[PDB]
């Protein structure tokens, strides 16, 4: 296809430019190439150090994608710089591994116990593993629904309470510490219907154990309160976007601020104190936005990625301040950085919780990048 070739040519040509600019825009850039593409990515909490070594070791929960051969749940170790056969190892290796029935849409560990890893299967089953019970048959199977799904979310204030979004217009909620299991299976403590179409994502409120937000193709954002009796009455419903909403994420330093990403090429800034008013809209992306993560370190900056192969980093503070037309190009003032090291759609990304500004993004070309934008791009 002509349009394909043209695209490809632009992709490759810009990527050359990128590489050449690398030393100016970044302080760290690693580009590993997994055996199989990953659809998920999340940094584990822990960090491992050794006296003497000029690096610390961090880890990522990755996944494999092959509708052909065997799939796996992966744990990758990564060597990151410090303040400053039998041969030394590559900076990136795969420590743990676990055969997985079908690609891994998402893989997220449980806050209260990082050994517990929840999984989203291309099936209808939501799997749970303990990467210790496997030094593969999952330690838990979660009934709940019929269609496949990506949305997945552990409750920080309620050990075990996990939520999942699905293509069957519903949201399940199981307690992993579920009384009994009747054959490694937990049915579903609740199922939230109230949603016109496919639910794209789900997210527990960070501080209020009985709250969470859903987002779906029915272009709406719904806030829920498990304490309610009707599993159809969402505490609130917001006409968040024009197109389908693919994701939502709560700000780590707030109890009211939210953020959603839609196919409408937009990221909406929401405040629970008044879901009637959309605080602001981040524009610049040129395609669907499936990911939106806040920096675990700075309350004012968040990131977004999608089909345009670009990862955008925005700084709320700069929302407003006037800018010169010849500068007001490239994008709005809230736009702080654009990462264009990826050559395909970015399937997922994660902020390193321990090393401010280190981020890990995964692409469909099975490429994995661990980068960190130049300090002068955000300092001074």
């Amino acid at each position: 296809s002509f349009d394909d070739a043209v695209e490809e040519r632009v992709i490759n040509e810009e990527y050359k430019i990128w590489k050449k600019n690398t030393p100016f825009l970044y302080d760290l850039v690693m580009t590993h190439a997994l055996e199989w593409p990953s659809l998920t990515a999340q940094w584990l909490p822990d960090v491992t150090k050794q006296d003497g070594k000029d690096y610390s070791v961090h880890r990522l929960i990755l996944g494999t994608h092959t509708s052909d051969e065997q799939n796996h749940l992966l744990i990758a170790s990564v060597q990151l710089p410090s303040e400053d056969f039998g041969s030394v190892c590559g900076k990136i290796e795969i420590e743990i591994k676990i055969n997985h029935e079908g690609e891994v849409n998402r893989a997220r560990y449980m806050p209260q116990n990082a050994c517990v890893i929840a999984t989203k299967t291309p099936s209808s089953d939501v799997l749970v593993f303990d990467y210790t019970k496997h030094p593969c048959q999952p330690d838990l199977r979660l009934r709940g629904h019929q269609k496949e799904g990506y949305g997945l979310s552990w409750n920080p204030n309620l050990n075990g309470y996990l939520l999942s979004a699905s293509d069957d217009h519903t949201i399940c909620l199981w307690d992993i510490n579920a009384t009994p299991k009747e054959h490694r299976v937990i049915d579903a403590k609740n199922i939230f219907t109230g949603h016109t179409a496919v639910v794209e994502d789900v997210a527990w409120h960070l501080l209020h154990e009985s709250l969470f937000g859903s987002v779906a193709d029915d272009q709406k954002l719904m806030i829920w309160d498990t304490r309610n009796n009707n599993t159809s009455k969402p505490s609130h419903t917001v006409d968040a976007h024009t197109a389908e909403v693919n994701c939502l994420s709560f700000n780590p330093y707030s109890e009211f601020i939210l953020a959603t990403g839609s196919a409408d090429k937009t990221v909406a800034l929401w405040d629970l104190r008044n879901l009637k008013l959309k605080l602001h809209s981040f524009e610049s992306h040129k395609d669907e936005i499936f990911q939106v993560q806040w920096s675990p370190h700075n309350e004012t900056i968040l990131a977004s990625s999608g089909t345009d192969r670009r990862l955008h980093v925005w700084d709320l503070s700069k929302i407003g301040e006037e800018q010169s037309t010849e500068d007001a190009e490239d994008g709005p003032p809230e736009l702080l950085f654009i990462h264009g090291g990826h050559t395909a759609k970015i399937s997922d990304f994660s902020w390193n919780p321990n090393e401010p500004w280190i981020i890990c993004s995964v692409s469909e070309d099975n490429i994995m990048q661990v980068w960190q934008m130049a300090e002068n791009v955000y300092n001074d």
């Binding site: 500068d327 490239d330 994008g331 736009l335 654009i338 264009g340 934008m373 130049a374 002068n376």
Partner: peptide, 11 residues
């Protein structure tokens, strides 16, 4: 060199 911020803006 605040053109790095500008450079970062392009993409």
């Amino acid at each position: 060199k605040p053109a790095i911020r500008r450079l970062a803006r392009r993409g």
